[PDB]
Every structure is written in structure tokens, then in C-alpha cells.
Design an enzyme around this catalytic site. Structure first.
Site, PDB file in Angstrom:
ATOM      1  N   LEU A 160      43.471   1.731 -16.651  1.00 42.74           N
ATOM      2  CA  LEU A 160      43.643   3.209 -16.035  1.00 42.74           C
ATOM      3  C   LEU A 160      42.687   3.086 -14.954  1.00 42.74           C
ATOM      4  O   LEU A 160      42.927   3.364 -13.803  1.00 42.74           O
ATOM      5  CB  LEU A 160      43.115   4.103 -16.987  1.00 42.74           C
ATOM      6  CG  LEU A 160      43.838   4.519 -18.245  1.00 42.74           C
ATOM      7  CD1 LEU A 160      43.278   5.500 -18.937  1.00 42.74           C
ATOM      8  CD2 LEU A 160      45.330   5.043 -17.781  1.00 42.74           C
ATOM      9  N   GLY A 161      41.612   2.403 -15.185  1.00 39.52           N
ATOM     10  CA  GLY A 161      40.460   2.004 -14.143  1.00 39.52           C
ATOM     11  C   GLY A 161      39.694   0.885 -14.295  1.00 39.52           C
ATOM     12  O   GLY A 161      39.689   0.393 -15.776  1.00 39.52           O
ATOM     13  N   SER A 162      38.938   0.492 -13.319  1.00 33.25           N
ATOM     14  CA  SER A 162      37.967  -0.791 -13.592  1.00 33.25           C
ATOM     15  C   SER A 162      36.828  -0.778 -12.766  1.00 33.25           C
ATOM     16  O   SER A 162      36.903   0.283 -11.645  1.00 33.25           O
ATOM     17  CB  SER A 162      38.964  -2.140 -13.333  1.00 33.25           C
ATOM     18  OG  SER A 162      38.909  -2.341 -11.841  1.00 33.25           O
ATOM     19  N   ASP A 216      26.061  12.992  -9.111  1.00 39.69           N
ATOM     20  CA  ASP A 216      27.232  12.577  -8.116  1.00 39.69           C
ATOM     21  C   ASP A 216      28.480  13.287  -8.566  1.00 39.69           C
ATOM     22  O   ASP A 216      29.253  12.991  -8.877  1.00 39.69           O
ATOM     23  CB  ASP A 216      27.580  10.973  -8.856  1.00 39.69           C
ATOM     24  CG  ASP A 216      28.571  10.483  -8.053  1.00 39.69           C
ATOM     25  OD1 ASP A 216      28.891  10.859  -6.801  1.00 39.69           O
ATOM     26  OD2 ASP A 216      29.134   9.245  -8.530  1.00 39.69           O
ATOM     27  N   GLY A 240      32.699  -2.373 -16.385  1.00 40.35           N
ATOM     28  CA  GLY A 240      33.741  -2.016 -17.508  1.00 40.35           C
ATOM     29  C   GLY A 240      35.139  -1.715 -17.058  1.00 40.35           C
ATOM     30  O   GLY A 240      35.386  -1.461 -15.936  1.00 40.35           O
TER      31      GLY A 240
END
Ligand SMILES: COc1cc2nccc(Oc3ccc(NC(=O)N[C@@H]4C[C@H]4c4ccccc4)nc3)c2cc1OC
Length: 253
Positions: free
Chosen positions: A16-18, A133, A22
Site C-alpha cells: 500500500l505504501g513504502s 507532523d 518499512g
């Protein structure tokens, strides 16, 4: 038991994400009679740095000692072929990308979502936790009516002036970011201060200038963004004040 059984977890091949440290994949965690859909952060440790494993475990401890309905929650950790952090899945993904793709979402729907975010932030504030953030990219949607705050990097355009000039982070600093987040939301995931360099933002703010009212945005909400953008931190409200103002407004409308 926070430590999960690997045999009970099944992952998808697609990410899904990188990031450098991780990858996040969709998975399913097997439970009693039902199966639970989860997001899994798989650690990437290509330099064999024992400090990296300690960071993943430190992050899981925070998720756990920070638990509320408006934050992405931890399911557990899985010591498998890699160290994994298993969390709830926020299906619809990030708020800014969602809104860019779904221009049909109404102003009422956006008030409800930012009020939930103001609720998770009020919570971190009571726990003496400073996010640092907060931005629309860190609000993940479970459904179109249910937002959860996340903290991927646990961004000058989301910074209060006293962050830039003196590096002073606090919950009031997070209140300034929340104001930028509300502007992103009523703008439908538009980028704040577009094309401006971080130095131009600073000079604009110290002139008392602020982003205009997004199209379609209720005036009451723009008034709240401006209060979130109060230059002098002493006079800027905290999240208890912000959330209460949002709550009343959402309960009236
Ligand atoms: C396809 O859409 C996606 C859906 C997702 N659902 C859930 C989680 C996802 O990623 C993550 C991965 C890691 C994290 N760590 C995280 O917040 N730690 C910090 C300590 C905890 C925290 C939370 C709130 C406030 C402060 C600190 N949080 C989300 C997802 C990623 C997705 O796409 C990339």
C-alpha cells in the site's frame, strides 16, 4: 497478548505504501470465528541496525499507550520473517488524496471529519503528546464518516512560527498544523501555500497574511482556522478549546 501468531496472519503481495525503513501491506488476521482486515508495517532493515528494531518496538509502545477511537490503533507485533507492526486498516486511505478524488463530499461531511480529528488531538494533548507532523496526509479514513490520526514519521507549511524561529514544539504548535489541515480539507486536498518556498511562507505569516477562505467553506470554520493561526502562542487556543468549538458547531448543524 500484543505478540501475534504469524500462522494467523495472511499478507497480500502488493504494497500500500513504502519507505526507507518499512513497507505497509494489507493483511488478514485470523480471529475466533471472524477474520479481521489489518494494515501491517513490515520493517526493512537492510543495514542490520539493531536500533531499527528498537524503533519499531518503541512505536508500538506509543500506539498502545496513546489508544483512542480517533487514532490508528495497534493490533499487536509479529516477530516473523521480519518484525511487523499490525494495526487497524483505514480502508479509504489518506484524507487529502481521498478528497482530491471525491469532490462530492459535502461541507457537513468535512466538519464531522475534522471534528473527529480535533477529538483525537484533544486526546494526545491530555496525554502530553506532541504529534509534530499533523497534516491531511496523516489522517487516514476508515469510512467516509470516520477519520483516524496516524504518525508515519514519528513540513514548514504546517509549522507555527515559533517552530521555525525557535524550534518550540507544543500542543499549541499542533493547533497551528490543525488549522492548516482544516484548510487542506475544505480545499479538497489542495496543497497549502502552493509553489511558495518555506521562507516565503514565514515572511507572509509575519506580515499577518493567511490563506483565504476555501470555496464553499462555511465562515464559522474559516474563523476557527484563523484562530488556529494566532501568531502569539499565548493567545492561540488549545485543543480542548478547538474541539469544544467544533463539537458545538457540528451538534448545532
Ligand atoms: C491503503 O491506505 C492505507 C491504510 C492504512 N491503514 C492503517 C495504517 C496505515 O499505515 C500506517 C503505517 C504506520 C503507522 N504508524 C503510526 O501511525 N505510528 C505512530 C505512533 C502512532 C501515532 C498515531 C497517532 C498520533 C501519534 C502517533 N500508521 C499508519 C495505512 C497505510 C495506507 O496506505 C499507505
Amino acid at each position: 497478548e500484543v505478540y501475534l501468531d504469524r500462522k494467523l496472519l495472511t499478507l497480500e503481495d502488493k504494497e500500500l505504501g513504502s519507505g526507507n525503513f518499512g513497507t505497509v501491506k494489507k493483511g488478514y488476521y485470523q480471529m475466533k470465528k471472524v477474520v479481521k482486515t489489518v494494515a501491517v508495517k513490515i520493517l526493512k532493515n537492510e543495514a542490520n541496525d539493531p536500533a531499527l528494531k528498537d524503533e519499531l518496538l518503541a512505536e508500538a509502545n506509543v500506539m498502545q499507550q496513546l489508544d483512542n477511537p480517533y487514532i490508528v490503533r495497534m493490533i499487536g507485533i509479529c516477530e516473523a520473517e521480519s518484525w511487523m507492526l499490525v494495526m487497524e486498516m483505514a480502508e479509504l486511505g489518506p484524507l487529502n488524496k481521498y478528497l482530491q478524488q471525491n469532490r462530492h463530499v459535502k461541507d457537513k461531511n468535512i466538519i464531522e471529519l475534522v471534528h473527529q480529528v480535533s477529538m483525537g488531538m484533544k486526546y494526545l494533548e491530555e496525554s502530553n503528546f506532541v504529534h509534530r507532523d499533523l497534516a491531511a496526509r496523516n489522517v487516514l479514513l476508515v469510512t467516509q464518516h470516520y477519520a483516524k490520526i496516524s504518525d508515519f514519521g514519528l513540513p514548514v507549511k504546517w509549522y507555527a512560527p515559533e517552530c521555525i524561529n525557535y524550534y518550540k514544539f507544543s500542543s499549541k504548535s499542533d493547533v497551528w498544523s490543525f488549522g492548516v489541515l482544516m484548510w487542506e480539507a475544505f480545499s479538497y486536498g489542495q496543497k497549502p501555500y502552493r509553489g511558495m518556498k518555506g521562507s516565503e511562507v514565514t515572511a507572509m505569516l509575519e506580515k499577518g497574511e493567511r490563506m483565504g477562505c476555501p470555496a464553499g467553506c462555511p465562515r464559522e470554520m474559516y474563523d476557527l482556522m484563523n484562530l488556529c493561526w494566532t501568531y502569539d502562542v499565548e493567545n492561540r487556543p488549545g485543543f480542548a478549546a478547538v474541539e469544544l468549538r467544533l463539537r458545538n458547531y457540528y451538534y448545532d448543524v
